[PDB]
Amino acid sequence: AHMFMAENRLQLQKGSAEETIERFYNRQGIETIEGFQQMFVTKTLNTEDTDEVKILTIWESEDSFNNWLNSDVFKEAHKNVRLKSDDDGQQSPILSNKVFKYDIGYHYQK
Amino acid sequence: AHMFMAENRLQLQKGSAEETIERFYNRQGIETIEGFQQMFVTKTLNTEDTDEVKILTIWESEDSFNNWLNSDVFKEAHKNVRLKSDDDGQQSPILSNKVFKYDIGYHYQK
Ligand code: HEM
Ligand code: HEM
Ligand SMILES: [Mg+2]
């Protein structure tokens, strides 16, 4: 069975990618979900308007990822996360997010 | 130093994602490039009119990628690759591509 990838794309105020990425340094429970395999946090190069940060998560199945979304550790990790348009959100550089889902058809490691 | 990721995003005719991904099973030189680490080939899950396949390459540095992009082996792997729009591209389901580049700010492996 193929691996599954979920991407959370963050649209951010220009210049804020680096401080946003630093927030991902320490784990907050994702690693405890059966089926989680690994994660990458990327900054999109050569952007001219808003910054872009992608959070890529790789799982043994889509069910594993859904289990994480419904988990208590997901809620705990996101409790102090705010969008800029939230009532108490003005200081946040995070404008919006968009989730993308993928089937991993092939993988190769050197 | 951070890892680097290059993405080649293919727009494909509806239904051709699976046949296109099978073309990546066999290596054609990239494993010989110093700095190359791994690759994922993904199909986007959605309801669009076209299929979308992404080729994600992970490298020790942007230089490693640049070296590959300019190499004889890159040329070899792509010598029979055509777009639908190419003079001899009648058989190809590949409509277009776009390259994206990313700095990898963080990685975690279970
Ligand atoms: C709903 C809108 C979301 C926003 C604005 C957002 C943003 C953030 C931020 C800023 C962090 C770091 C939290 C901190 O500072 O402690 C975080 C955690 C994280 N987010 Fe999200 N997130 C959202 C939902 C999602 C979704 C849907 C995914 C699926 C890919 C995702 C993937 C991750 C991962 C893997 C972590 C680290 C979790 C851990 O270590 O346990 N997030 N998110
Ligand atoms: C000019 C536009 C491009 C098109 C239409 C295209 C399409 C393809 C296709 C269909 C294959 C399968 C091999 C075959 O059928 O012989 C392939 C090989 C491959 N492509 Fe591309 N590609 C392009 C440029 C790129 C770029 C810019 C990247 C950078 C990420 C890339 C990454 C790869 C990799 C990693 C392989 C396997 C290489 C190996 O095993 O040595 N391609 N390409
Ligand atoms: Mg910038």
Curated annotation (Swiss-Prot), chains A, B:
Main location: cytoplasm
Substrates-to-products reaction catalysed: heme b + 5 AH2 + 4 O2 + 2 H(+) = delta-staphylobilin + Fe(2+) + formaldehyde + 5 A + 4 H2O; heme b + 5 AH2 + 4 O2 + 2 H(+) = beta-staphylobilin + Fe(2+) + formaldehyde + 5 A + 4 H2O
Nuclease in keyword set: no
Annotated positions binding heme: R23, F24, Y25, N26, R27, Q28, G29, I30, H78
Keyword Methyltransferase: no
Residue span, ABM domain: 4-95
Pfam family, one: ABM
GO cellular component: cytoplasm
Entry EC number(s): 1.14.99.48
Entry keywords, A to Z: Cytoplasm, Heme, Iron, Metal-binding, Monooxygenase, Oxidoreductase
Membrane-crossing segments per the record: none
GO biological process: heme catabolic process; iron import into cell
UniProt subcellular location: Cytoplasm
Domain of life: Bacteria
UniProt-listed PROSITE patterns: ABM (PS51725)
GO MF, any single term: heme binding
Effect of W68F: Heme degradation activity is approximately half that of the wild-type enzyme
Enzyme class: oxidoreductase
Residues where Fe cation binds: N8
Site (described: Transition state stabilizer): W68
Complex formation: Homodimer.
Family that this chain belongs to: Belongs to the antibiotic biosynthesis monooxygenase family. Heme-degrading monooxygenase IsdG subfamily.
Purpose: Allows bacterial pathogens to use the host heme as an iron source. Catalyzes the oxidative degradation of the heme macrocyclic porphyrin ring to the oxo-bilirubin chromophore staphylobilin (a mixture of the linear tetrapyrroles 5-oxo-delta-bilirubin and 15-oxo-beta-bilirubin) in the presence of a suitable electron donor such as ascorbate or NADPH--cytochrome P450 reductase, with subsequent release of free iron.
Protein name: Heme oxygenase (staphylobilin-producing) 2
Organism: Staphylococcus aureus (strain N315)
Protein's gene: isdI
